[PDB]
């Protein structure tokens, strides 16, 4: 039936850690062709998690100076990223991006002692770190932000060291080790 | 041949013109209405063109400009309000008050509702000035007309 961009129905979803699935809350209710839907998230708390993970990605990619708020071209950039990802690696772009989000989130943060991270803000911080990596890769890295974000996604998914989100997680855990 | 909206603005500004004219001239008696003694102002306007709270405030001004004592003057004003039949009254006279320090006082009776759209629709207010020897005395007088029925009132028979 429903197919994202008329391409992916994501009929298979990795189990993740049984909490990220509800955090992303992607299902037939959340299915859509293109990002930038009209879903509400400020009448409750659960609805904020109910917004789909790809929607959160497109609406978090937009922050850099003048580019702020251009979520139509957030749609464009994520579509191009999916297109290039699907044949740079054979995996479904949504699925590989899901594993990337799964392993790109810090689990314990030592702000003030250490605190376990809730699944919601674990997802939010994984997305935030991915967005910052993509921004610093649009910073003076020759290649286009399409390839920058795609490389960040695949690097997070395969757990390689060249990923800024993983480096920031390592920094956080290093602070945790130093405190404890 | 003028626009209806500009015509409405002209009606409003002329309403203000005649209202201030009536305030200026009518200072010796009440209000007998408006015309759509008499000879003077009718000829003036034709040549130029071709229990009431206002009454109570002007009456206090009348009792005040001549040098009568403020306390008894205002007290008699509130007696007049009560004998007229108002629910309450509020008379403020602020200014020099015989001293070099500005001063005001308040004389409240009844509820004296003071906020809300029904409060505006029910309360009548008036303001006036009195020219004195070394200053201006500002008088604000508020009377609430007796209650259509007030929103708050509830009584079942």
């Amino acid at each position: 039936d429903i197919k994202l961009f008329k391409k992916w129905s994501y009929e298979e979803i990795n189990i993740a850690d049984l909490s990220l699935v509800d955090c992303i809350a992607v299902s037939q209710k959340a299915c859509v062709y293109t990002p930038h839907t009209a879903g509400r998230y400020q009448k409750k708390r659960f609805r904020k998690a109910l917004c789909p993970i790809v929607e959160r990605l497109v609406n978090s990619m937009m922050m850099h100076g003048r580019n702020n708020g251009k979520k139509l071209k957030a749609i464009r950039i994520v579509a191009y990223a999916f297109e290039i990802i699907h044949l740079m690696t054979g995996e479904n772009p949504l699925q590989v991006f899901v594993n990337a989000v799964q392993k790109g989130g810090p689990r314990e943060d030592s702000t003030r002692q250490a605190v376990d991270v809730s699944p919601l803000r674990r997802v939010n911080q994984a997305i935030y770190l991915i967005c910052t990596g993509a921004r610093n890769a649009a910073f003076r890295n020759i290649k286009s932000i399409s390839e920058c974000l795609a490389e960040e996604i695949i690097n997070c998914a395969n757990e390689s060291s060249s990923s800024y989100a993983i480096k920031k997680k390592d920094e956080i855990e290093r602070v945790a080790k130093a405190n404890r | 041949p003028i626009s209806k909206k500009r015509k409405f603005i002209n009606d409003g500004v002329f309403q203000a013109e005649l209202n201030e004219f009536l305030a200026r001239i009518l200072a010796e008696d009440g209000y007998s209405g408006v015309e759509v003694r008499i000879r003077e102002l009718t000829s003036l306007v034709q040549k130029r063109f071709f229990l009431c709270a206002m009454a109570q405030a002007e009456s206090l001004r009348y009792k005040l400009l001549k040098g009568l004592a403020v306390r008894r003057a205002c007290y008699g004003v509130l007696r007049h309000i009560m004998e007229s039949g108002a629910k309450g009254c509020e008379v403020i006279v602020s200014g020099k008050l015989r001293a070099q320090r500005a001063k005001s006082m308040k004389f409240r009776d009844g509820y004296l509702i003071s906020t809300g759209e029904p409060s505006k629709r029910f309360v009548n207010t008036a303001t006036r000035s009195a020219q004195l020897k070394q200053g201006v005395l500002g008088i604000k007088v508020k009377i609430m007309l007796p209650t259509s029925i007030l929103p708050d009132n509830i009584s079942v028979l």
Binding site: - | K4, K5, F8, V36
Partner: protein, 98 residues
């Protein structure tokens, strides 16, 4: 026959009288016209001096006007109107035949 004013009660009562008289005279009368409201709004600054927080306030005037048509004598319709109309309402006349 179009009327204009700013408050709604006056136009309501005069239109009521108008169609009551129309029913009395059993004449060719067009249907009522119920125009969308037209509002005049201005916004002005409080605080006559230049001191204090900049506070403004807004105003509104809702102008009300409607239209009707009747097939009767101009003299008789103007008399029956001027008998029971408040001069605060402005009314103009257009006749109809068929």
């Amino acid at each position: 026959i179009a009327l204009t004013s700013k408050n709604l009660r006056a136009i309501e009562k005069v239109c009521s009288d108008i169609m009551k008289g129309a029913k009395e005279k059993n004449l060719n009368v067009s249907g009522p016209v119920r125009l969308p409201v037209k509002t005049l709004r201005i916004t002005t600054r409080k605080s006559p001096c230049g001191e204090g927080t900049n506070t403004w306030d807004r105003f509104e005037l809702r102008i009300y006007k409607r239209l009707i048509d009747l097939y009767s004598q101009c003299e008789v319709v103007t008399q029956m109107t001027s008998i029971n109309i408040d001069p605060v309402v402005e009314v103009e006349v257009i006749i109809t035949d068929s």
